Write a protein that binds this DNA or RNA. Structure first.
Ligand SMILES: [Cl-]
Ligand SMILES: [Cl-]
Ligand SMILES: [Cl-]
Ligand SMILES: [Cl-]
Ligand SMILES: [Cl-]
Ligand SMILES: [Cl-]
Ligand SMILES: [Cl-]
Ligand SMILES: [K+]
Ligand SMILES: [Mg+2]
Ligand SMILES: [Mg+2]
Ligand SMILES: [Mg+2]
Ligand SMILES: [Mg+2]
Ligand SMILES: [Mg+2]
Ligand SMILES: [Mg+2]
Ligand SMILES: [Mg+2]
Ligand SMILES: [Mg+2]
Ligand SMILES: [Mg+2]
Ligand SMILES: [Mg+2]
Ligand SMILES: [Mg+2]
Ligand SMILES: [Mg+2]
Ligand SMILES: [Mg+2]
Ligand SMILES: [Mg+2]
Ligand SMILES: [Mg+2]
Ligand SMILES: [Mg+2]
Ligand SMILES: [Mg+2]
Ligand SMILES: [Mg+2]
Ligand SMILES: [Mg+2]
Ligand SMILES: [Mg+2]
Ligand SMILES: [Mg+2]
Ligand SMILES: [Mg+2]
Ligand SMILES: [Mg+2]
Ligand SMILES: [Mg+2]
Ligand SMILES: [Mg+2]
Ligand code: NA
Ligand code: NA
Ligand code: NA
Ligand code: NA
Ligand code: NA
Ligand code: NA
Ligand code: NA
Ligand code: NA
Ligand code: NA
Ligand code: NA
Ligand code: NA
Ligand code: NA
Ligand code: NA
Ligand code: NA
Ligand code: NA
Ligand code: NA
Ligand code: NA
Ligand code: NA
Ligand code: NA
Ligand code: NA
Ligand code: NA
Lengths: 142, 337, 156, 172, 132
RNA sequence: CGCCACACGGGGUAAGAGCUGAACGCAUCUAAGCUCGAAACCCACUUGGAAAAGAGACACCGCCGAGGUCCCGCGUACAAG
RNA sequence: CGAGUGGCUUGCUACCUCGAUGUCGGUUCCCUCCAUCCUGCCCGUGCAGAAGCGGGCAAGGGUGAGGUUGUUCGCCUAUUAAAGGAGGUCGUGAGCUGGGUUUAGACCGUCGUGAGACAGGUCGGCUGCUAUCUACUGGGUGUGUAGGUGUCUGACAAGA
RNA sequence: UGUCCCAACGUUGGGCCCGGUGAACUGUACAUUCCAGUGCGGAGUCUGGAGACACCCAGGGGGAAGCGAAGACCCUAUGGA
RNA sequence: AGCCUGUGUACCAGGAGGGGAACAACCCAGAGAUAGGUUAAGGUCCCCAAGUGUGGAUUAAGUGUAAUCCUCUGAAGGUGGUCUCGAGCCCUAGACAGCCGGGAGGUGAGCUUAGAAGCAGCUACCCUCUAAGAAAAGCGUAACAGCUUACCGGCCGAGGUU
């Protein structure tokens, strides 16, 4: 609720990893970032293998635990966390100044980062984070 | 060779820890089929007796014949829906929106709640109707409580409070149905929700047994033969293999046993009456005498005598309802002797 | 015993029968097949070329040869063609069958050393290449991947 | 590459984004034609399927889009019809259309009715031991016919002896 | 099989010795197995009223002795519950030798038999003197 | 050792059965698209779960007093707590 | 005949430990693998049916009781849908057992002049420790979120 | 005939809480770990990830190749008896 | 064999520092202190200093993002998955494929055989009509019939085939 984001990024139809990589770089530069429409973010590849990977992450675990997110919400945030030294003070500070959102709770329309957009007209092998979460068993709350 | 064998006890009711609320909390509700109506009720366990019934089963080679059936007597006096809570759908699931309360309160509801002295029912109702206009309204439930004071055999006067969902025709129709019940005084009874012969799910916190060993808690064997005399009688062989070099939470160990919440499915309601017809001579042991609104549940119910138990229309019934079964005899024979 | 044990040419040449006794006889039945009465006076000449230097036990030679010639009977017992396996198993092979003590092995067989690109088999046929098939079956029983090569034959 | 399909006088074909709709006296069919770098557009009197690539995979889809559209032209005018024949050896098979699904009773003596739901605006008219599956959407009609035949599939016993079932008699 | 129309607490185990309630020439029977039964690790296979068990003859006529036959449990000391809640128990444990078709190998049955055994083995029942 | 209760059904798949369909005018279950289809997967159901660091929501009561601890009689609870 | 995969057997090597990492078999209790014995869904058949044989997907669940033997293995019996195989320091002795191997006593056979020996058999022949850390099963006290009562939400977690 | 199927209830002494008395074993250091990898090929400490708010009570002993004993087996010594 | 045993050499042992996730001997590099600068190996999307660099092409498997190696497997065999280069032959005198039509008679050849007629077996395999048509390439029949290949014509229209 209420997040003074210096930058509001729109993930719709963008390559999750390429966005995450930039959002990481920016948060480590002191910027407060908000990623919007996470459910509509995308990752290239064969849906079948992609889903197997994430499903494997859900099944992995033990008493010590391996909490892997199912909602497009967390998937994206965990993706960003992997590009930050989240256990160091600086890393945790940056990570905590980044938040991902399902849809867009803001008035402004986020901006599209360079080189992160995927052209649906020249690409058929890709998947929506939202679709991934549905496969994982998430509750489509979007 | 080492023969195979199922593990000891289920891994689906854990962790096996002490329940947070002695008052059960359903985590599921029936589907919105029929007319609007509260989807649950509560009562206090009293004891057991048996009753002779006429075989009601259309597929039984015995249909129509006498039949002895165990029953647990539960005192089910009227409860009171003291408010209507509204939920709104959000990207993070459902969240309470607002509540519509009344002014008529049971003399001792203040033993549990800080009873409202100033509330704006209409504003609440407005906010809810707006929500519904916008289409963000999530299910509708009623804040309910019991009147232990109406049950002499039960020491408490402090009422037990729980939220029960309201499932009905349209959202608008049942929203109205909710408000109607609340506004009055919320006073409702077992009759209004259940009919003898229907299947209900009964939830409740089981009888506590404090700390118990693996044998009792998980069903592991006792040491056998010569092993039973060496110094070990009720201890498992080992806490696991060399590797992984850690004890897995799946190995049966000592701990709290009992006093857990359980939702026992498909319990048939044999009868719903009022009076002392079901009471036993000498009185129900460790309970007392029954003489008021009661419900006869087929079989057993989780929890000890006096504990609060909750009813809910079965969410996954196997059989079709066979209303008002003929009861030819209810035993009142003393439970002592 | 698997070919894994002897297919490599990492050992010294070991073929001097004057210093080696008890060498098992070869299982290869013949080296000249078909019409050996006639000389290579045929239109087409196909060859089975080995593509990697390897050792081929007399075991594999016989099975490879049989599988090829036994099939070349798509032309008949006295058919018009001549088949030649040009290599002979000269290399004597051992096995250490005590542990690694006094391990010099005892003679257990023989193998032929073929260098990549040599032809192990050469058939002579009239435009009737059933031989091309006889070889698909032959390089099936020898360790290396092989090249089926046709020389005199621009009758494609 | 680029192919041009002159639309029939009897038809009107509109298309926004990746969806094409074809309407005729017999109905309307809308399809999604989505493939990397293949543009499908309605240029007045002709539908155009073009792309800047000529690799095998691209040509394959272009040819597929073509037959898909022509098939739609045909479905909105002449229409599509599959003919079927119910057949039984001992137990009189009863095939009826009830609601939006065809039900088959007494199959090989079975007490439990076998059924399947019809796809789209496909008409399954049954007359005696003859069935006619028709509609403007070849995809839908084709499946409905197929599902009907599949509905009598048997794996448990020898099919050569137990031949009961409904079969496609005439393919459009 | 068909419902016995009564709940049973198996009172017999693999190895138990029981009476042969017929005139086949076999006096004592030793239980070996229970038809259609599968237990669990360490559990002794159990058998009670109405079960068809495989058996061996321990006592009786030389020709009958040592033979491995089939039989049906007709009586047991351990209680059983009838629909009306009443419990029923017998003075001894007994079985009657049966064949492939479940027809008593003998001509006469000695002693009473539980009514529930009728709802399963007709020919055995229709050969009973007393059916309680 | 006694008694009660413990689904079905949706969704997506594998092997497999097919539809439409091109590369390759034909053919083709597959390349794009689609219909079905496992005790397996997801949901459903039961249990735990505000320490989920985005550390939550709602209603009322209260900030000179709401509520709570200690105390006393007791257990539907319990090795201390 | 040719090419491989596994790391359960056996052999090889001598890298690790001789200021000791307690043996075999069994038991008890937990997790896993699939090369699937049963169960589900399928394909082929020398598929009429019934009963089979062979193959594919598939590890959810099941795979049990006994007679000889220390046995593992294996032989045998009656049941069974089936009574699959394998890994976890040949899982598991700060858990049990101690029948076998392999101490000191003794006998027999064989060998030795003899002491005595045996990759032969046999009878008898011991099982230590009060848990510091870690791990997990359950139970509390505090702090953080930032006054209280009551009711909820559900990120995730477990289930056969 | 409770050795077993298959375990239950009970009795007495402990265990648990309280007053008083009051040791020992053991300790290079650090130490909230888990999954993998690596390494003299059997890692709480190296590497990558995952998880992880602190303290305390009770428990049964998975790990610290746990503690205890300069290996009895085996070999070696121009050792002993 | 992370085996045993030679040999030449460089290294570890006794060798830091940079790189290689970690890691005696692999790469750079041989090093007094301190300071500024430029490179080496290696690297430049983030973690992480430096490119989401440029021209062009391939790959759809998450192949791959793995110099060396106990350590990074993947083989014989197979692939109308796809891209590129070559050669031969056919083709607007209309090819390849498909669809339509024609596939005729002497004559159901002779022989054998109850039989045999394109098609059990044996021999032969001729000539007529014609724009085609085997003494019949594959099914089928008890033998016929029937269904088709070869062969010809039409429709179509551009590359096709090896
Ligand atoms: Cl986990
Ligand atoms: Cl970090
Ligand atoms: Cl694509
Ligand atoms: Cl034991
Ligand atoms: Cl048995
Ligand atoms: Cl130097
Ligand atoms: Cl990936
Ligand atoms: K040692
Ligand atoms: Mg002992
Ligand atoms: Mg009593
Ligand atoms: Mg009584
Ligand atoms: Mg059959
Ligand atoms: Mg046992
Ligand atoms: Mg140890
Ligand atoms: Mg498999
Ligand atoms: Mg499993
Ligand atoms: Mg072991
Ligand atoms: Mg084991
Ligand atoms: Mg141990
Ligand atoms: Mg010990
Ligand atoms: Mg101890
Ligand atoms: Mg012993
Ligand atoms: Mg002994
Ligand atoms: Mg002994
Ligand atoms: Mg803090
Ligand atoms: Mg770490
Ligand atoms: Mg020593
Ligand atoms: Mg010695
Ligand atoms: Mg001496
Ligand atoms: Mg040194
Ligand atoms: Mg940088
Ligand atoms: Mg890979
Ligand atoms: Mg390599
Ligand atoms: Na990707
Ligand atoms: Na996980
Ligand atoms: Na002891
Ligand atoms: Na003892
Ligand atoms: Na151990
Ligand atoms: Na030797
Ligand atoms: Na080969
Ligand atoms: Na399904
Ligand atoms: Na909180
Ligand atoms: Na040591
Ligand atoms: Na053991
Ligand atoms: Na399984
Ligand atoms: Na045995
Ligand atoms: Na060990
Ligand atoms: Na011990
Ligand atoms: Na042991
Ligand atoms: Na006892
Ligand atoms: Na331990
Ligand atoms: Na040096
Ligand atoms: Na390094
Ligand atoms: Na990959």
């Amino acid at each position: 609720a209420e997040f003074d984001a210096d930058v509001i990024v729109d993930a719709r139809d963008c390559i999750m990893g390429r966005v995450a990589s930039q959002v990481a770089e920016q948060a480590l530069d002191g910027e407060t970032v908000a990623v919007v429409n996470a459910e509509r973010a995308v990752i290239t590849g064969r849906e079948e293998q992609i889903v197997e990977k994430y499903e494997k992450r859900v099944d992995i675990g033990n008493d010590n635990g391996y909490f892997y997110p199912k909602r497009p919400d967390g998937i994206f945030k965990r993706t960003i966390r992997g590009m930050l030294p989240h256990k160091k003070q600086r890393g945790r500070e940056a990570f905590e100044s980044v938040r991902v959102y399902l849809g867009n709770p803001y008035d402004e329309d986020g901006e599209v980062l360079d080189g992160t957009s995927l052209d649906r007209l020249s690409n058929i092998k890709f998947v929506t984070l939202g679709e991934i979460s549905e496969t994982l068993g998430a509750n489509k709350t979007w | 060779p080492q023969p195979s064998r199922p593990r000891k006890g289920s891994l689906g009711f854990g962790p096996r820890k002490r329940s947070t609320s002695e008052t059960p909390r359903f985590n599921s509700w029936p589907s919105d089929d029929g007319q609007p109506g509260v989807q649950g009720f509560a009562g206090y366990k009293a004891g057991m007796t048996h009753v002779v019934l006429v075989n009601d089963e259309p597929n039984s080679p015995r249909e129509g014949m006498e039949e002895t059936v165990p029953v647990t007597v539960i005192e089910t006096p009227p409860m009171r829906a003291v408010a209507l809570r509204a939920y709104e759908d959000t990207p993070y699931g459902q969240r309470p929106l607002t509540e519509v309360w009344t002014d008529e309160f049971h003399s001792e509801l203040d033993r549990t709640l800080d009873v409202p002295e100033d509330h704006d029912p209409d504003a609440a109702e407005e906010q809810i109707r707006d929500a519904h206009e916008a289409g963000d309204l999530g299910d509708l439930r009623l804040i309910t409580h019991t009147v232990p004071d109406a049950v002499p055999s039960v020491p408490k006067k402090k009422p037990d409070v729980m939220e029960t969902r309201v499932g009905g025709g349209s959202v608008s129709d049942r929203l109205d149905h909710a408000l109607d019940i609340v506004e009055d005084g919320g006073e409702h009874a077992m009759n209004d929700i259940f009919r003898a012969g229907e299947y209900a799910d009964v939830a409740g916190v089981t009888k506590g047994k404090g700390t118990q060993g693996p044998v009792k808690r998980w069903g592991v064997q006792k040491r056998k033969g010569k092993h039973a005399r060496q110094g070990w009688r009720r201890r498992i062989g080992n806490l696991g293999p060399w590797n992984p070099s850690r004890v897995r939470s799946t190995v049966p160990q000592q701990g709290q046993t009992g006093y857990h919440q359980r939702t026992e499915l498909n319990k048939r309601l044999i009868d719903i009456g009022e009076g002392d017809e079901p009471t036993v001579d000498g009185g129900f042991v460790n309970y007392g005498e029954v003489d008021g609104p009661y419900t006869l549940v087929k079989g057993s119910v989780p929890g000890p005598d006096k504990r609060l138990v909750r009813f809910r229309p079965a969410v996954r019934p196997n059989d079709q309802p066979r209303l008002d079964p003929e009861v030819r005899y209810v035993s009142n024979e003393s439970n002592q002797g | 015993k698997p070919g894994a044990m002897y297919r490599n040419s990492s050992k010294p040449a070991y073929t001097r029968r004057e210093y080696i006794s008890g060498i098992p006889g070869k299982k290869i039945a013949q080296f000249d097949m078909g019409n050996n009465g006639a000389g290579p006076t045929y239109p087409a000449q196909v060859e089975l070329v080995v593509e990697k230097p390897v050792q081929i036990r007399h075991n594999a030679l016989e099975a490879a040869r049989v599988a090829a010639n036994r099939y070349v009977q798509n032309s008949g017992a006295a058919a018009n063609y001549k088949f030649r396996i040009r290599k002979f198993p000269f290399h004597v092979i051992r096995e250490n069958k005590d542990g690694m003590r006094a391990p010099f092995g005892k003679p257990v067989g023989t193998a032929a050393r073929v260098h990549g690109a040599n032809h192990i088999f050469i058939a002579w046929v009239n435009p009737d290449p059933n031989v091309e098939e006889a070889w698909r079956r032959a390089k099936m029983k020898v360790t290396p991947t092989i090249n089926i090569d046709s020389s005199p034959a621009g009758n494609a | 590459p680029r192919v041009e399909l002159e639309i029939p006088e009897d038809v009107d074909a509109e298309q926004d984004h990746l969806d094409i709709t074809v309407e005729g006296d017999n109905g309307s069919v809308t399809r999604r034609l989505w493939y990397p770098d293949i543009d499908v557009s309605v240029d007045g009197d002709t539908v155009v399927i073009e792309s800047d690539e000529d690799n095998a995979k691209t040509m394959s889809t272009i040819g597929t889009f073509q037959s898909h559209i022509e098939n739609m032209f045909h479905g909105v005018t002449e229409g599509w019809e599959y003919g079927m024949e119910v057949f039984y050896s001992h137990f009189p098979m009863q095939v009826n259309v009830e609601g939006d699904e065809v039900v088959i009773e007494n199959f090989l003596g079975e007490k439990a009715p076998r059924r399947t739901t019809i796809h789209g605006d496909t008409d399954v008219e049954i007359d005696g031991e003859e069935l006619t599956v028709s509609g403007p959407d070849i995809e839908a009609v084709g499946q409905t016919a197929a599902d009907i035949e599949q509905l009598t599939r048997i794996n448990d016993k020898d099919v050569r002896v137990f031949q009961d079932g409904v079969y496609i008699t005439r393919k459009p | 099989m068909e419902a016995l129309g009564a709940d049973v607490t198996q009172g017999l185990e693999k190895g138990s010795l029981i009476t042969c309630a017929d005139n086949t020439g076999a006096r004592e029977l030793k239980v070996i197995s229970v038809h259609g039964y599968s237990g669990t690790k360490n559990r002794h296979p159990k058998a009670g009223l109405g079960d068809k068990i495989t058996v061996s003859v321990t006592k009786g006529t030389p020709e009958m002795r040592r033979q491995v036959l089939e039989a049906v449990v007709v009586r047991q000391r351990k209680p059983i519950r009838r629909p009306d809640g009443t419990r029923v128990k017998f003075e001894d444990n007994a079985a009657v030798i049966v064949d492939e078709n479940e027809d008593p190998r003998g001509t006469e049955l000695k002693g009473p038999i539980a009514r529930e055994v009728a709802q399963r083995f007709g020919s055995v029942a229709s050969a009973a003197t007393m059916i309680v």
